[PDB]
């Protein structure tokens with residue numbers, strides 16, 4: 001009956017679920033377990049490049065806190 | 071023209087605030103509260119001199135007062151601050167609004183152990199006044215002497231001497 005349309009809808013739903021979950025896991029993987037930094041504005045880009053400099057390992061996502069200062 | 075004068079590399083050595091942008095953003099309100107005076111002396115010197123070479127030492131005072139700002143966090147409230155800037159650091163836009171309970175723990179421990187009150191909505195954007203001893207720059211643009219203006223019109227307006235003087239027209 002009407003539940004015969006649900007396997008195709010479920011397959012199409014998995015195909016629509018793959019890009020979002022994929023880009024979420026890839027952005028968590030490539031950014032040190034966290035969200036990708038959003039730099040729409042030049043202040044955000046300046047802070048992100050300053051993070052890349054102060055990390056010392058050429059990665060913006062490697063965070064340095066109070067342990068880095070004496 | 072001339073040689074542009076630059077300070078030496080020893081004149082630029084200061085101990086850097088080597089912390090991340092989420093670390094700076096986490097403590098930024100208490101930083102603007104407690105490190106007001108050297109930061110504003112520096113930014114006054116920076117908008118008035120219009121020259122960063124004349125703004126090194128005040129800048130060093132900024133980098134002197136920021137580090138003492140973080141040491142005073144590290145001696146007292148290292149763990150709630152760390153729990154707070156980690157939560158700031160997770161967000162891609164670095165939302166303050168996702169991190170209110172860690173903010174509350176950090177603000178509680180800072181008000182208890184250091185007595186610092188966090189600035190309210192509208193305080194760190196105030197135009198404040200700065201009492202320095204350095205003199206006012208009399209020519210910050212290094213402008214030379216302006217050309218003298220043309221002489222203005224004076225004297226009462228007389229009629230035209232014998233009119234237009236155009237070939238034979240007597241008026």
Ligand SMILES: CCCCCCCCCCCCCCCCCC(=O)OC[C@H](COP(=O)([O-])OC[C@H](O)COP(=O)([O-])OC[C@H](COC(=O)CCCCCCCCCCCCCCCCC)OC(=O)CCCCCCCCCCCCCCCCC)OC(=O)CCCCCCCCCCCCCCCCC
Pocket residue numbers: 238239240241
């Ligand atoms: C107390 C308060 C009250 C007091 C009241 C006192 C007055 C009471 C009376 C009231 C009426 C006053 C009339 C005006 C003042 C006198 C004007 C005068 O005689 O000027 C002499 C003027 C120069 O003589 P002046 O000895 O040096 O001056 C004596 C005065 O002191 C003249 O004064 P100025 O020395 O200061 O002159 C200034 C200067 C003197 O001029 C100059 O310095 C040289 C430059 C002049 C222009 C040259 C242009 C040339 C190329 C174009 C030619 C066009 C074609 C010719 C005309 C074809 C037909 C239109 O004028 C100009 O440059 C302006 C241009 C000329 C205008 C003249 C007046 C025209 C009014 C009537 C128009 C009708 C047609 C007239 C002829 C048009 C052609 C001019 O003569 C000419 O230039 C030759 C033209 C003839 C003069 C016009 C006479 C006006 C009356 C005409 C009646 C008949 C009409 C017939 C039907 C229409 C024609 C088909």
Ligand SMILES: CCCCCCCCCCCCCCCCCC(=O)OC[C@H](COP(=O)(O)OCCN)OC(=O)CCCCCCCCCCCCCCCCC
Pocket residue numbers: 011014015
């Ligand atoms: C994001 C999600 C995307 C999902 C996409 C896919 C959705 C559909 C998934 C498959 C659904 C079941 C398909 C079954 C097909 C029929 C199988 C079968 O029994 O075929 C029989 C045929 C002949 O058999 P025979 O041995 O000759 O029989 C004589 C018996 N005495 O034997 C044959 O024809 C040979 C065997 C053919 C098997 C084909 C199976 C389907 C292949 C589809 C390609 C995509 C598969 C999934 C990819 C993603 C996952 C890895």
